[PDB]
Amino acid sequence: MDETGKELVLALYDYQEKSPREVTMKKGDILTLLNSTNKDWWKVEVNDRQGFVPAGYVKKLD
């Protein structure tokens, strides 16, 4: 983007990672948004765990 921290999203739903590139979310998680260049798949990080999640499963704090 280039990739920055600070930017945040909030998990709307539970989401258990479905491949190595992904990360697991719990409803209500505050995740650092690292890459949102893709509209559908966002690179996020929670408690140092990093991966791609469906962008439609979180809300961006903006």
Short mmCIF file of N, CA, C and O in Angstrom, two decimals, residues 20-39:
data_model
loop_
_atom_site.label_atom_id
_atom_site.label_comp_id
_atom_site.label_asym_id
_atom_site.label_seq_id
_atom_site.Cartn_x
_atom_site.Cartn_y
_atom_site.Cartn_z
N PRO A 20 -3.42 -21.99 5.35
CA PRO A 20 -2.29 -21.34 6.01
C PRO A 20 -2.17 -19.83 5.82
O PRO A 20 -1.62 -19.16 6.69
N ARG A 21 -2.65 -19.30 4.70
CA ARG A 21 -2.51 -17.86 4.45
C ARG A 21 -3.44 -17.02 5.33
O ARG A 21 -3.31 -15.79 5.37
N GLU A 22 -4.38 -17.68 6.02
CA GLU A 22 -5.43 -17.03 6.78
C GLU A 22 -5.10 -16.92 8.27
O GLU A 22 -4.06 -17.40 8.73
N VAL A 23 -5.98 -16.26 9.01
CA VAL A 23 -5.85 -16.11 10.47
C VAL A 23 -7.25 -16.25 11.06
O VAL A 23 -8.24 -15.94 10.41
N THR A 24 -7.32 -16.73 12.30
CA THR A 24 -8.60 -16.94 12.99
C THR A 24 -9.03 -15.68 13.74
O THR A 24 -8.23 -15.03 14.44
N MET A 25 -10.31 -15.35 13.59
CA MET A 25 -10.95 -14.24 14.29
C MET A 25 -12.07 -14.71 15.21
O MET A 25 -12.76 -15.70 14.90
N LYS A 26 -12.24 -14.00 16.32
CA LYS A 26 -13.42 -14.11 17.18
C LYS A 26 -14.23 -12.84 17.01
O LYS A 26 -13.67 -11.75 16.93
N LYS A 27 -15.55 -12.99 16.94
CA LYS A 27 -16.47 -11.85 16.93
C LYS A 27 -16.03 -10.83 17.97
O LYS A 27 -15.78 -11.19 19.13
N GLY A 28 -15.90 -9.58 17.56
CA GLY A 28 -15.50 -8.50 18.46
C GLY A 28 -14.01 -8.18 18.48
O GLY A 28 -13.60 -7.18 19.10
N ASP A 29 -13.19 -9.00 17.80
CA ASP A 29 -11.73 -8.79 17.78
C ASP A 29 -11.41 -7.44 17.13
O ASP A 29 -12.08 -7.00 16.21
N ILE A 30 -10.38 -6.79 17.65
CA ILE A 30 -9.85 -5.59 17.03
C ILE A 30 -8.58 -6.03 16.34
O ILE A 30 -7.64 -6.51 16.99
N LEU A 31 -8.59 -5.92 15.02
CA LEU A 31 -7.47 -6.38 14.20
C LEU A 31 -6.77 -5.21 13.52
O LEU A 31 -7.42 -4.28 13.03
N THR A 32 -5.45 -5.27 13.49
CA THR A 32 -4.67 -4.28 12.75
C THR A 32 -4.79 -4.58 11.26
O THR A 32 -4.54 -5.71 10.83
N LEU A 33 -5.18 -3.58 10.48
CA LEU A 33 -5.35 -3.76 9.04
C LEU A 33 -4.07 -3.38 8.32
O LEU A 33 -3.67 -2.21 8.32
N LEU A 34 -3.42 -4.36 7.71
CA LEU A 34 -2.10 -4.16 7.11
C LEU A 34 -2.19 -3.92 5.61
O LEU A 34 -1.47 -3.09 5.07
N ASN A 35 -3.06 -4.68 4.95
CA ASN A 35 -3.24 -4.54 3.49
C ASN A 35 -4.71 -4.67 3.09
O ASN A 35 -5.31 -5.72 3.27
N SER A 36 -5.27 -3.59 2.52
CA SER A 36 -6.66 -3.55 2.10
C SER A 36 -6.77 -3.11 0.64
O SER A 36 -7.80 -2.58 0.22
N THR A 37 -5.69 -3.31 -0.13
CA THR A 37 -5.68 -3.01 -1.58
C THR A 37 -6.71 -3.87 -2.33
O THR A 37 -7.31 -3.43 -3.31
N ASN A 38 -6.90 -5.10 -1.86
CA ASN A 38 -7.96 -5.95 -2.36
C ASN A 38 -9.24 -5.60 -1.62
O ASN A 38 -9.23 -5.35 -0.42
N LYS A 39 -10.35 -5.57 -2.35
CA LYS A 39 -11.63 -5.22 -1.75
C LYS A 39 -12.26 -6.40 -0.99
O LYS A 39 -13.14 -6.20 -0.16
#
